Amino acid sequence: AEVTQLSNGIVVATEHNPSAHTASVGVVFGSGAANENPYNNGVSNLWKNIFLSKENSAVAAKEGLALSSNISRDFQSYIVSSLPGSTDKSLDFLNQSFIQQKANLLSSSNFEATKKSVLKQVQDFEDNDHPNRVLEHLHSTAFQNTPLSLPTRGTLESLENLVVADLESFANNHFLNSNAVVVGTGNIKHEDLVNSIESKNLSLQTGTKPVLKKKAAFLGSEVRLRDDTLPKAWISLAVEGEPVNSPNYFVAKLAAQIFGSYNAFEPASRLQGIKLLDNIQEYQLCDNFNHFSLSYKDSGLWGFSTATRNVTMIDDLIHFTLKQWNRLTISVTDTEVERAKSLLKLQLGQLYESGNPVNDANLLGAEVLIKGSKLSLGEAFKKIDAITVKDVKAWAGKRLWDQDIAIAGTGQIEGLLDYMRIRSDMSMMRW
Amino acid sequence: WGGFSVSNPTIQRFFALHYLVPFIIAAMVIMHLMALHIHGSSNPLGITGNLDRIP
């Protein structure tokens, strides 16, 4: 994780990796689904898919290049992968797709084909990907009438109303030098890239700034997509979490590691040192669960997702889980905190120390767009070790104890009690 | 009456029975609640309440 950064108009960011065999170069823009509105929602996803269109890919294939694009909430990415030497061909491609073939990708024949594909994509997702669909609705209700509420894939209604003009409108307002960072990961050197970029010049809509809007807000609420024909009940529940780069960023992630994730069907998962597992395994309250601490620019979500076929005991599932959360405020043990520290480190390692360069590109770009630099793993590990039981209790007393929640669920959710019942479990009685 | 007219035997037994019946009523109230429970309460719309129940 070598932090190499230089500015001369365009902000270049690289990260050399001796052991690699490949390289990835691309551009990451500081705008995502959150920078959209209810009506052009899905525009970014649209751009992602036209950049991956067969036409624009056949070109890159002949040059021995692979195409990648990721649409998130606070950012977007367009990455080109190649061998360690063909790094220059990569730049020729980025220079082409965003300055040359800008029109070829937006042809009537291409746009219509792409629009029809993402339309079918988003539909299959809303029809079949229940856990992600529900997680998406958690964001939709938790942050309603606020930026973070818009699904990254966009909605069907807004998607079929999108036209070529919308792409351009968005592109002119967001694909800008001031809202961009050219990323280079793999084994390519800093100077090798900075010179290959400095070779070409021009500008194409430079010196501009992205539009501003309303501040993200968490609203205690719920959205219920009951469907009695589905075999399970999928639900996500959470409280207002921590925004990226917050004093309690790590404490929140540690807290989520304490309750972790579980998969009823995998032997080792059933043996984890998680207290909650003693309560849910007897009557097999669920097939799986996964805690999370989602972080964004303005806010975050802390909670968990779960799936179950135990439709008559969902109230017990929710009751025991929230009852464990109460513990973070009043009785989390020292050894629970230590187990989380270890497991947190391991996870952050598997994320940042992945062998894949495209991942590092997204991580690098996104991070420098916010804090100017990428967080060194060694500094993260030190902050994680510094965390104490008191730290955890102080955080939970603020974010968890007797706080509003956001709920979302689909399928056989008749057994999921009213908001107030779930809400009451955010605290315990006492003298 | 326990005699020729409402008199001592009557008032005394009436007190004994006054104390007894309220416990019989309590028992019937349990039978009442048992019969209510298997079908649940009705509602002002006179139709099924199964599609929307609250605790």
Which residue in B has a C-alpha nearest to residue A226's C-alpha?
B51
Q: What is the DSSP string of B13-48?
A: HHHHHHHHHHHHHHHHHHHHHHHHHHH----TT-S-
User: Which residues are within 8 A (CB) of A139 and not within 5 positions of it... i.e. 6 or more apart?
Assistant: A148, A149, A151, A301
Whether the CB of A230 is below 8 Å from some CB of chain B: the reply is no
Helix (H) or strand (E) holding A123: helix A108-128
| A124: contact with B, CB 8 A cutoff | no
Q: Which of A64, A91, A69 is nearest to A79 (CA)?
A: A69
Give the bridge partners for A234, in sequence order: A307, A410
Chain B residues in contact with A418 (beta carbon < 8 A): 54-55
The 3-state secondary structure of A372-414 reads CCCCCHHHHHHHHHHCCHHHHHHHHHHHCCCCCCEEEEEECCC
Alpha-carbon distances of A10 from A79, A301, A385, rounded to whole Å: 17, 33, 37
A196 vs A86: CA distance, rounded Å: 11
DSSP state of A282: T
Closest alpha carbon to A88 in A64, A69, A104: A64
**CA triplet A130, A135, A141: central angle to 5 degrees?**
120
**With the C-alpha atoms ordered A12, A16, A22, A28, is the resulting torsion angle positive or negative?**
negative
State yes or no: B32 annotated in a binding site. yes
Burial class (CB in 10 A: 0-12, 13-18, 19+), A62: exposed
Nearest chain A Cα distance for residue B29, angstroms:
29
The nearest CA of chain B is from the CA of A294 a distance in Å of 32
- Helix or strand (DSSP H, E) at A190: helix A190-199
Rounded CA separation A224/A411 (Å): 9
Q: In this structure, what are the phi and psi dihedrals at residue A398, rounded to the nearest 5 degrees?
A: -90, -50
Name the residue in chain A with its Cα closest to that of B54: A418
Torsion angle of C-alpha atoms A347, A348, A351, A354, degrees rounded to 10 = -90
Contact between A392 and A337 (Cβ < 8 Å) = yes
Beta strands in A189-267 (DSSP E): 221-226, 233-240, 261-263
Adjacency order of strands within the sheet including A23-29? A4-7, A11-16, A180-186, A23-29, A76-82, A66-71
Is residue A360 within 8 Å of A26, Cβ to Cβ? no
Phi/psi at A118 (nearest 5 deg)? -70, -25
Best mutation target among B48, B50, B54 (most A Cβ atoms within 10 Å) is B54
Cα–chain center distance at A410: 21
B37 is in an annotated binding site: yes
Interface list for chain B against chain A, based on CB atoms closer than 8 Å: 54-55
Instruction: Pull the structure tokens for residue A399.
Output: 């974010």
Whether A66 and A25 have beta carbons less than 8 Å apart is answered as no
Nearest chain A residue to B51, by CA: A414
DSSP string, A35-81: GS-TTTTTHHHHHHHHHT-HHHHHHHHHTT-EEEEEE-SS-EEEEEE
Q: Which residue segments constitute the domains of chain A, with CATH numbers given? A: 1-202 (3.30.830.10), 209-431 (3.30.830.10)
Interface A:B, Cβ pairs < 8 A: 4
Q: Half-sphere exposure of residue A51, counting CA atoms within 13 Å on the CB side?
A: 28
CA distance A273 to A260: 10
Least Cα distance to A90 among A156, A219, A182, A162 occurs for A182
Residue A54 in contact with partner chain B when CB distance is under 8 A: no
* Residues of chain B neighbouring A421 (CB-CB closer than 8 A): 55
CA A364 to CA A28: how far, in whole Å?
9
| Contact (CB, 8 A) for A300 and A240 | yes
| Both structure tokens of A285 | 């309250």
Q: Which residues, numbered 386 to 425 in chain A, qualify as contacts with chain B under a Cβ-Cβ cut-off of 8 Å? A: 417-418, 421
List of chain B residues whose C-beta atoms are within 8 Å of the C-beta of residue A417: 55
> What distance in Å separates residue B42's CA from the closest CA in chain A?
19
Q: Measuring CA to CA, which residue among A138, A222, A151, A198 is closest to residue A417?
A: A222
Q: A118 with A93: CB under 8 angstroms?
A: no
Cα–Cα distance for residue pair A81/A60, rounded to 1 Å: 10
Q: At what angle do helices A377-386 and A249-259 cross, to 10 degrees?
A: 70
Two structure tokens written together for A66:
């692979």
Query: From the CA of A418, how many Å to the nearest CA of chain B?
Result: 7
CB A17 within 8 A of CB A185: yes
Provide, as residue numbers in chain A, all residues whose Cβ is less than 8 Å from the Cβ of B55.
417-418, 421
A226 touches chain B (CB under 8 A): no
Q: What is the largest CA-CA distance in chain B?
A: 63
Residues of A in contact with B51 (CB under 8 A): none
Residues in A closer than 8 angstroms to B54, CB to CB, are 418
Does residue A284 come out as left (phi exceeding 0), alpha (psi in the -120 to 50 range) or beta? left
Token pair, residue A141, equals 């209700």
Residue with tokens 């395994």: A281
Phi, psi at A408, each rounded to 5°? -150, 145
Distance from CA of A414 to the nearest CA of B (A): 9
The approach used to solve this structure was X-ray
DSSP H helical ranges for A262-354:
267-270, 276-281, 314-330, 334-352
Q: Contact at 8 Å (CB) between A411 and A234?
A: yes
Instruction: For residue A314, give the nearest of A304, A302, A324, A306 by alpha carbon.
Output: A306
